[PDB]
PDB file of C-alpha atoms and ligand atoms in Angstrom:
ATOM      1  CA  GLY A  11       0.000   0.000   0.000  1.00 23.98           C
ATOM      2  CA  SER A  12       0.853   3.707  -0.185  1.00 21.92           C
ATOM      3  CA  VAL A  13       2.911   5.633   2.355  1.00 23.21           C
ATOM      4  CA  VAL A  14       0.575   7.719   4.500  1.00 26.75           C
ATOM      5  CA  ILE A  15       1.085  11.046   6.219  1.00 28.19           C
ATOM      6  CA  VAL A  16       0.202  10.673   9.921  1.00 29.70           C
ATOM      7  CA  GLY A  17       1.491  13.890  11.444  1.00 30.59           C
ATOM      8  CA  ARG A  18       4.009  16.688  11.206  1.00 31.55           C
ATOM      9  CA  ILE A  19       7.028  18.001  13.086  1.00 32.49           C
ATOM     10  CA  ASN A  20       6.337  21.612  13.790  1.00 33.00           C
ATOM     11  CA  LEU A  21       8.623  24.624  13.997  1.00 33.39           C
ATOM     12  CA  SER A  22       5.855  27.064  12.953  1.00 34.31           C
ATOM     13  CA  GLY A  23       5.566  29.263  16.025  1.00 34.45           C
ATOM     14  CA  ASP A  24       8.335  29.312  18.624  1.00 36.82           C
ATOM     15  CA  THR A  25       8.707  25.739  19.893  1.00 38.56           C
ATOM     16  CA  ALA A  26       9.592  22.468  18.126  1.00 37.37           C
ATOM     17  CA  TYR A  27       6.879  19.804  18.589  1.00 38.47           C
ATOM     18  CA  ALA A  28       5.224  16.810  16.934  1.00 40.19           C
ATOM     19  CA  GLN A  29       1.573  16.801  15.830  1.00 40.96           C
ATOM     20  CA  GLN A  30       0.063  13.406  15.157  1.00 41.54           C
ATOM     21  CA  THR A  31      -2.768  14.077  12.606  1.00 44.07           C
ATOM     22  CA  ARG A  32      -3.975  10.468  12.075  1.00 44.10           C
ATOM     23  CA  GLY A  33      -4.538   7.220  14.003  1.00 43.65           C
ATOM     24  CA  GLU A  34      -3.309   3.698  13.272  1.00 41.90           C
ATOM     25  CA  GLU A  35      -6.512   1.899  12.258  1.00 39.50           C
ATOM     26  CA  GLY A  36      -7.279   4.733   9.853  1.00 38.84           C
ATOM     27  CA  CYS A  37      -3.745   4.433   8.495  1.00 37.77           C
ATOM     28  CA  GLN A  38      -3.996   0.828   7.239  1.00 35.13           C
ATOM     29  CA  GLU A  39      -7.053   1.911   5.179  1.00 32.98           C
ATOM     30  CA  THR A  40      -5.908   5.115   3.467  1.00 32.38           C
ATOM     31  CA  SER A  41      -2.876   2.956   2.640  1.00 31.08           C
ATOM     32  CA  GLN A  42      -5.339   0.670   0.829  1.00 30.79           C
ATOM     33  CA  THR A  43      -6.852   3.436  -1.347  1.00 32.10           C
ATOM     34  CA  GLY A  44      -4.225   6.196  -1.322  1.00 36.25           C
ATOM     35  CA  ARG A  45      -6.932   8.856  -1.006  1.00 37.68           C
ATOM     36  CA  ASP A  46      -5.770  11.113   1.848  1.00 37.40           C
ATOM     37  CA  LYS A  47      -8.352  13.813   2.599  1.00 34.31           C
ATOM     38  CA  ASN A  48      -6.688  14.862   5.880  1.00 34.46           C
ATOM     39  CA  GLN A  49      -5.267  18.361   6.212  1.00 37.26           C
ATOM     40  CA  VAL A  50      -1.456  18.534   5.677  1.00 38.50           C
ATOM     41  CA  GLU A  51       0.649  21.503   6.760  1.00 37.63           C
ATOM     42  CA  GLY A  52       4.257  22.644   6.733  1.00 35.84           C
ATOM     43  CA  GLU A  53       7.723  21.401   5.912  1.00 32.82           C
ATOM     44  CA  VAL A  54       8.454  18.226   7.976  1.00 32.89           C
ATOM     45  CA  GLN A  55       5.906  15.378   7.843  1.00 34.81           C
ATOM     46  CA  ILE A  56       5.686  12.089   9.705  1.00 34.29           C
ATOM     47  CA  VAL A  57       4.772   9.375   7.199  1.00 30.98           C
ATOM     48  CA  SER A  58       4.202   5.699   7.762  1.00 30.67           C
ATOM     49  CA  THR A  59       4.028   2.478   5.877  1.00 29.10           C
ATOM     50  CA  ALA A  60       2.367  -0.622   7.355  1.00 29.19           C
ATOM     51  CA  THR A  61       5.585  -1.574   9.184  1.00 30.43           C
ATOM     52  CA  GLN A  62       7.551   1.651   9.647  1.00 31.06           C
ATOM     53  CA  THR A  63       7.327   5.299  10.723  1.00 32.61           C
ATOM     54  CA  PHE A  64       9.877   7.917   9.656  1.00 36.03           C
ATOM     55  CA  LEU A  65      10.007  11.521   8.406  1.00 38.08           C
ATOM     56  CA  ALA A  66       9.876  13.314   5.037  1.00 37.25           C
ATOM     57  CA  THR A  67      10.978  16.803   4.011  1.00 39.66           C
ATOM     58  CA  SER A  68       9.681  19.272   1.437  1.00 39.56           C
ATOM     59  CA  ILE A  69      12.321  21.370  -0.270  1.00 35.73           C
ATOM     60  CA  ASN A  70      11.258  23.322  -3.378  1.00 34.65           C
ATOM     61  CA  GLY A  71       8.203  21.327  -4.505  1.00 33.90           C
ATOM     62  CA  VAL A  72       9.482  17.856  -3.695  1.00 35.14           C
ATOM     63  CA  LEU A  73       8.719  15.844  -0.581  1.00 31.86           C
ATOM     64  CA  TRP A  74      11.942  13.866   0.009  1.00 34.97           C
ATOM     65  CA  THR A  75      12.505  10.890   2.270  1.00 38.19           C
ATOM     66  CA  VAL A  76      14.580   7.652   2.416  1.00 36.80           C
ATOM     67  CA  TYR A  77      14.080   4.732   0.108  1.00 34.23           C
ATOM     68  CA  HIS A  78      14.888   2.434   3.045  1.00 33.36           C
ATOM     69  CA  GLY A  79      11.657   3.630   4.587  1.00 34.35           C
ATOM     70  CA  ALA A  80       9.326   4.246   1.664  1.00 31.00           C
ATOM     71  CA  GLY A  81      10.508   1.472  -0.676  1.00 30.40           C
ATOM     72  CA  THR A  82       8.860   1.894  -4.073  1.00 32.65           C
ATOM     73  CA  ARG A  83       5.569   3.093  -2.587  1.00 32.40           C
ATOM     74  CA  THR A  84       3.242   5.780  -3.834  1.00 31.12           C
ATOM     75  CA  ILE A  85       2.117   8.352  -1.288  1.00 32.17           C
ATOM     76  CA  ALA A  86      -1.514   9.064  -0.379  1.00 31.05           C
ATOM     77  CA  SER A  87      -2.989  12.293  -1.739  1.00 33.31           C
ATOM     78  CA  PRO A  88      -6.458  13.850  -1.949  1.00 31.03           C
ATOM     79  CA  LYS A  89      -6.588  12.681  -5.630  1.00 27.48           C
ATOM     80  CA  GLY A  90      -5.178   9.141  -5.193  1.00 29.95           C
ATOM     81  CA  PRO A  91      -1.755   7.472  -5.110  1.00 30.50           C
ATOM     82  CA  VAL A  92       1.077   9.868  -6.087  1.00 32.93           C
ATOM     83  CA  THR A  93       3.933   8.012  -7.895  1.00 33.30           C
ATOM     84  CA  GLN A  94       7.578   8.652  -6.910  1.00 33.98           C
ATOM     85  CA  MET A  95       9.099  11.540  -8.871  1.00 32.83           C
ATOM     86  CA  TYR A  96      12.613  10.312  -8.066  1.00 30.92           C
ATOM     87  CA  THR A  97      13.965   6.912  -6.990  1.00 29.05           C
ATOM     88  CA  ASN A  98      17.690   6.418  -6.315  1.00 32.30           C
ATOM     89  CA  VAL A  99      18.415   3.176  -4.431  1.00 31.74           C
ATOM     90  CA  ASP A 100      22.177   3.799  -4.025  1.00 36.46           C
ATOM     91  CA  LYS A 101      21.650   7.202  -2.401  1.00 36.75           C
ATOM     92  CA  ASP A 102      18.714   5.890  -0.312  1.00 36.11           C
ATOM     93  CA  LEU A 103      16.469   8.495  -1.919  1.00 35.87           C
ATOM     94  CA  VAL A 104      12.849   8.978  -2.959  1.00 33.41           C
ATOM     95  CA  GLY A 105      11.034  12.126  -4.013  1.00 34.50           C
ATOM     96  CA  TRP A 106       7.323  12.752  -4.607  1.00 32.10           C
ATOM     97  CA  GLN A 107       5.713  16.041  -5.439  1.00 32.18           C
ATOM     98  CA  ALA A 108       5.169  18.245  -2.328  1.00 32.21           C
ATOM     99  CA  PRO A 109       1.653  17.384  -0.989  1.00 34.02           C
ATOM    100  CA  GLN A 110      -1.070  19.986  -0.939  1.00 35.94           C
ATOM    101  CA  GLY A 111      -1.264  22.153   2.136  1.00 36.95           C
ATOM    102  CA  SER A 112       2.495  21.945   2.691  1.00 39.77           C
ATOM    103  CA  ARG A 113       5.171  24.532   2.994  1.00 40.64           C
ATOM    104  CA  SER A 114       8.600  23.948   1.493  1.00 41.92           C
ATOM    105  CA  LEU A 115      12.015  24.810   2.882  1.00 44.81           C
ATOM    106  CA  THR A 116      14.666  26.860   1.093  1.00 41.53           C
ATOM    107  CA  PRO A 117      17.975  25.101   0.079  1.00 44.45           C
ATOM    108  CA  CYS A 118      20.998  26.296   2.117  1.00 45.42           C
ATOM    109  CA  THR A 119      23.397  28.702   0.327  1.00 46.77           C
ATOM    110  CA  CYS A 120      25.246  30.171   3.369  1.00 46.72           C
ATOM    111  CA  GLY A 121      27.624  27.181   3.642  1.00 46.75           C
ATOM    112  CA  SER A 122      27.534  27.366   7.463  1.00 53.10           C
ATOM    113  CA  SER A 123      28.905  24.311   9.191  1.00 55.72           C
ATOM    114  CA  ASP A 124      26.829  24.653  12.326  1.00 54.47           C
ATOM    115  CA  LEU A 125      23.664  22.627  11.686  1.00 54.73           C
ATOM    116  CA  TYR A 126      20.564  21.157  13.375  1.00 54.45           C
ATOM    117  CA  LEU A 127      18.930  17.758  12.977  1.00 58.04           C
ATOM    118  CA  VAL A 128      15.209  17.344  13.633  1.00 58.22           C
ATOM    119  CA  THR A 129      14.051  14.034  15.056  1.00 55.14           C
ATOM    120  CA  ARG A 130      10.563  12.565  15.108  1.00 55.23           C
ATOM    121  CA  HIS A 131      10.269  13.683  18.794  1.00 49.33           C
ATOM    122  CA  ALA A 132      10.644  17.393  18.054  1.00 51.02           C
ATOM    123  CA  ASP A 133      14.230  17.542  19.370  1.00 50.49           C
ATOM    124  CA  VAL A 134      16.393  19.945  17.333  1.00 52.01           C
ATOM    125  CA  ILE A 135      19.869  18.541  18.043  1.00 51.93           C
ATOM    126  CA  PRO A 136      23.063  20.523  17.322  1.00 52.52           C
ATOM    127  CA  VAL A 137      25.386  19.024  14.686  1.00 53.78           C
ATOM    128  CA  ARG A 138      28.714  20.430  13.457  1.00 53.28           C
ATOM    129  CA  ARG A 139      29.216  19.723   9.750  1.00 54.56           C
ATOM    130  CA  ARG A 140      32.168  17.404   9.078  1.00 51.87           C
ATOM    131  CA  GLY A 141      32.399  17.032   5.291  1.00 51.58           C
ATOM    132  CA  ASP A 142      30.192  16.180   2.303  1.00 49.80           C
ATOM    133  CA  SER A 143      27.602  13.758   3.732  1.00 46.50           C
ATOM    134  CA  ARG A 144      28.444  13.725   7.402  1.00 43.10           C
ATOM    135  CA  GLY A 145      28.144  15.638  10.681  1.00 41.97           C
ATOM    136  CA  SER A 146      29.230  15.119  14.269  1.00 39.95           C
ATOM    137  CA  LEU A 147      26.846  15.447  17.184  1.00 40.91           C
ATOM    138  CA  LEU A 148      27.999  17.821  19.950  1.00 37.47           C
ATOM    139  CA  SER A 149      26.497  15.434  22.495  1.00 40.88           C
ATOM    140  CA  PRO A 150      26.347  11.802  21.441  1.00 42.66           C
ATOM    141  CA  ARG A 151      23.112   9.799  21.924  1.00 41.40           C
ATOM    142  CA  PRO A 152      22.026   6.174  21.810  1.00 44.19           C
ATOM    143  CA  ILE A 153      20.919   5.057  18.359  1.00 43.24           C
ATOM    144  CA  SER A 154      17.413   4.202  19.515  1.00 44.47           C
ATOM    145  CA  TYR A 155      16.897   7.929  20.295  1.00 44.01           C
ATOM    146  CA  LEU A 156      17.093   8.700  16.562  1.00 41.86           C
ATOM    147  CA  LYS A 157      15.463   5.667  14.950  1.00 42.69           C
ATOM    148  CA  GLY A 158      12.359   6.833  13.138  1.00 45.10           C
ATOM    149  CA  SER A 159      14.025  10.164  12.271  1.00 45.80           C
ATOM    150  CA  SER A 160      15.306   9.282   8.774  1.00 43.84           C
ATOM    151  CA  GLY A 161      13.795  11.708   6.258  1.00 41.58           C
ATOM    152  CA  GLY A 162      14.049  14.705   8.528  1.00 40.61           C
ATOM    153  CA  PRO A 163      16.144  17.644   7.451  1.00 41.53           C
ATOM    154  CA  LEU A 164      19.384  19.012   8.815  1.00 39.28           C
ATOM    155  CA  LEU A 165      18.966  22.783   9.046  1.00 40.31           C
ATOM    156  CA  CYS A 166      21.446  25.617   9.000  1.00 37.42           C
ATOM    157  CA  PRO A 167      21.290  28.510  11.488  1.00 34.23           C
ATOM    158  CA  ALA A 168      18.743  30.434   9.318  1.00 33.83           C
ATOM    159  CA  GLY A 169      16.028  27.847   8.465  1.00 31.85           C
ATOM    160  CA  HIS A 170      17.361  26.438   5.162  1.00 27.19           C
ATOM    161  CA  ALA A 171      17.851  22.755   4.437  1.00 25.35           C
ATOM    162  CA  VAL A 172      21.329  21.225   4.054  1.00 25.99           C
ATOM    163  CA  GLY A 173      20.219  17.645   3.704  1.00 26.28           C
ATOM    164  CA  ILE A 174      18.068  14.696   4.611  1.00 29.91           C
ATOM    165  CA  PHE A 175      19.025  12.374   7.469  1.00 29.18           C
ATOM    166  CA  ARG A 176      20.083   8.946   6.138  1.00 28.02           C
ATOM    167  CA  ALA A 177      22.079   6.976   8.758  1.00 28.59           C
ATOM    168  CA  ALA A 178      23.929   7.216  12.094  1.00 28.42           C
ATOM    169  CA  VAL A 179      27.595   6.421  12.763  1.00 27.79           C
ATOM    170  CA  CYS A 180      27.643   4.196  15.850  1.00 27.05           C
ATOM    171  CA  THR A 181      30.068   2.348  17.958  1.00 26.90           C
ATOM    172  CA  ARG A 182      29.022   0.756  21.230  1.00 26.60           C
ATOM    173  CA  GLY A 183      25.425   1.581  20.221  1.00 27.97           C
ATOM    174  CA  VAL A 184      26.272   5.263  20.582  1.00 29.42           C
ATOM    175  CA  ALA A 185      25.872   7.849  17.805  1.00 31.64           C
ATOM    176  CA  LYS A 186      28.447  10.632  17.660  1.00 32.30           C
ATOM    177  CA  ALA A 187      27.786  11.446  13.971  1.00 30.56           C
ATOM    178  CA  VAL A 188      25.234  11.085  11.163  1.00 30.01           C
ATOM    179  CA  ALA A 189      24.974  10.500   7.420  1.00 27.12           C
ATOM    180  CA  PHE A 190      22.812  12.708   5.248  1.00 27.29           C
ATOM    181  CA  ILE A 191      22.020  13.290   1.552  1.00 25.77           C
ATOM    182  CA  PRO A 192      23.166  16.863   1.010  1.00 23.86           C
ATOM    183  CA  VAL A 193      20.930  19.340  -0.812  1.00 24.77           C
ATOM    184  CA  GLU A 194      23.509  19.636  -3.616  1.00 25.79           C
ATOM    185  CA  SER A 195      22.798  15.902  -4.115  1.00 27.90           C
ATOM    186  CA  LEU A 196      19.018  16.445  -4.471  1.00 27.42           C
ATOM    187  CA  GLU A 197      18.906  18.945  -7.357  1.00 29.07           C
ATOM    188  CA  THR A 198      21.562  16.754  -9.005  1.00 30.96           C
ATOM    189  CA  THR A 199      18.872  14.056  -8.874  1.00 27.70           C
ATOM    190  CA  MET A 200      16.214  16.390 -10.310  1.00 28.75           C
TER     191      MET A 200
HETATM  192  C1  SUE B 301      19.237   6.907  13.678  1.00 31.13           C
HETATM  193  C2  SUE B 301      18.574   5.982  12.722  1.00 31.13           C
HETATM  194  C3  SUE B 301      19.029   6.129  11.301  1.00 31.13           C
HETATM  195  C4  SUE B 301      18.452   7.214  10.511  1.00 31.13           C
HETATM  196  C5  SUE B 301      18.039   5.806  10.245  1.00 31.13           C
HETATM  197  N1  SUE B 301      18.714   5.096   9.189  1.00 31.13           N
HETATM  198  C6  SUE B 301      19.060   3.858   9.300  1.00 31.13           C
HETATM  199  O1  SUE B 301      18.802   3.212  10.256  1.00 31.13           O
HETATM  200  C7  SUE B 301      19.808   3.319   8.290  1.00 31.13           C
HETATM  201  C8  SUE B 301      19.098   2.316   7.448  1.00 31.13           C
HETATM  202  C9  SUE B 301      20.231   1.380   7.018  1.00 31.13           C
HETATM  203  C10 SUE B 301      20.951   1.230   8.265  1.00 31.13           C
HETATM  204  N2  SUE B 301      20.923   2.549   8.870  1.00 31.13           N
HETATM  205  C11 SUE B 301      21.754   3.033   9.765  1.00 31.13           C
HETATM  206  O2  SUE B 301      21.590   4.141  10.209  1.00 31.13           O
HETATM  207  C12 SUE B 301      22.744   2.233  10.242  1.00 31.13           C
HETATM  208  C13 SUE B 301      22.475   1.767  11.673  1.00 31.13           C
HETATM  209  C14 SUE B 301      23.390   0.674  12.015  1.00 31.13           C
HETATM  210  C15 SUE B 301      21.123   1.205  11.852  1.00 31.13           C
HETATM  211  C16 SUE B 301      22.715   2.889  12.652  1.00 31.13           C
HETATM  212  N3  SUE B 301      24.023   2.959  10.207  1.00 31.13           N
HETATM  213  C17 SUE B 301      25.001   2.766   9.317  1.00 31.13           C
HETATM  214  O3  SUE B 301      24.757   1.965   8.461  1.00 31.13           O
HETATM  215  O4  SUE B 301      26.148   3.466   9.438  1.00 31.13           O
HETATM  216  C18 SUE B 301      27.057   3.369   8.416  1.00 31.13           C
HETATM  217  C19 SUE B 301      27.961   4.495   8.237  1.00 31.13           C
HETATM  218  C20 SUE B 301      26.801   4.356   7.335  1.00 31.13           C
HETATM  219  C21 SUE B 301      27.039   3.869   5.927  1.00 31.13           C
HETATM  220  C22 SUE B 301      25.847   4.168   5.035  1.00 31.13           C
HETATM  221  C23 SUE B 301      24.608   3.302   5.377  1.00 31.13           C
HETATM  222  C24 SUE B 301      23.645   3.206   4.242  1.00 31.13           C
HETATM  223  C25 SUE B 301      22.318   3.842   4.500  1.00 31.13           C
HETATM  224  C26 SUE B 301      21.375   3.013   4.008  1.00 31.13           C
HETATM  225  N4  SUE B 301      21.043   3.114   2.739  1.00 31.13           N
HETATM  226  C27 SUE B 301      20.139   2.302   2.263  1.00 31.13           C
HETATM  227  C28 SUE B 301      19.765   2.377   0.952  1.00 31.13           C
HETATM  228  C29 SUE B 301      18.821   1.498   0.490  1.00 31.13           C
HETATM  229  C30 SUE B 301      18.230   0.562   1.298  1.00 31.13           C
HETATM  230  O5  SUE B 301      17.337  -0.268   0.772  1.00 31.13           O
HETATM  231  C31 SUE B 301      16.292  -0.731   1.524  1.00 31.13           C
HETATM  232  C32 SUE B 301      18.632   0.486   2.600  1.00 31.13           C
HETATM  233  C33 SUE B 301      19.556   1.347   3.072  1.00 31.13           C
HETATM  234  N5  SUE B 301      19.898   1.223   4.313  1.00 31.13           N
HETATM  235  C34 SUE B 301      20.789   2.046   4.796  1.00 31.13           C
HETATM  236  O6  SUE B 301      21.142   1.980   6.060  1.00 31.13           O
HETATM  237  C35 SUE B 301      16.569   5.532  10.678  1.00 31.13           C
HETATM  238  O7  SUE B 301      16.146   6.205  11.567  1.00 31.13           O
HETATM  239  N6  SUE B 301      15.801   4.660  10.059  1.00 31.13           N
HETATM  240  S1  SUE B 301      14.347   4.405  10.451  1.00 31.13           S
HETATM  241  O8  SUE B 301      13.577   5.604  10.427  1.00 31.13           O
HETATM  242  O9  SUE B 301      14.284   3.875  11.791  1.00 31.13           O
HETATM  243  C36 SUE B 301      13.522   3.130   9.287  1.00 31.13           C
HETATM  244  C37 SUE B 301      12.099   3.352   9.210  1.00 31.13           C
HETATM  245  C38 SUE B 301      12.964   3.762   8.110  1.00 31.13           C
HETATM  246 ZN1   ZN B 302      22.212  28.264   5.046  1.00 29.40          ZN
END
């Protein structure tokens, strides 16, 4: 079945917080039809498949996420299933067209190396950029704390997107760094 939107990570007002906008029973049904009537808002969504929950990010008219979450699934829209606009397995990438209601982020051009990852829990965790696809956390966390966050953006200190969270670098079960698909790598895909 189709990937379904089931909430959003908000940074609209002042505070960073999750907003579940759908329940579970009524997930495994919209995922049958792919007709999502529910109101969608803003940049960072929570989407789910039957088995998994993870994030997805809109940057200039494309809702991006990870292929390792979404597989080759359509997404649910008010008009039916919306086919993937972009599907790179190697990168771990999947793009659809930005769903209706949404906002979209602006792609980062300031080349700052201070960044901010956004987990499914509404935590905006500091990350110092460390080259190409990678960043180091200022305060390491256990892996489990970040599972379900793939698809969320890394932001720069002015609101723009630098990439999309892909994987976490762990030893001992502890994450001191992460792997993301940089924005330069997205428009290359387009
Ligand atoms: C903090 C959680 C973290 C963000 C999450 N990502 C992962 O867990 C990924 C998925 C998988 C293993 N991942 C990892 O993070 C591992 C892990 C040991 C688990 C820390 N880390 C790791 O390999 O480190 C190595 C240095 C990097 C080398 C690069 C790794 C390659 C990345 C990757 N690519 C592809 C492309 C296609 C695939 O086809 C199906 C599959 C893939 N799988 C991949 O990695 C997540 O939250 N997921 S999620 O939301 O819970 C789930 C619902 C969706
Ligand atoms: Zn920037």
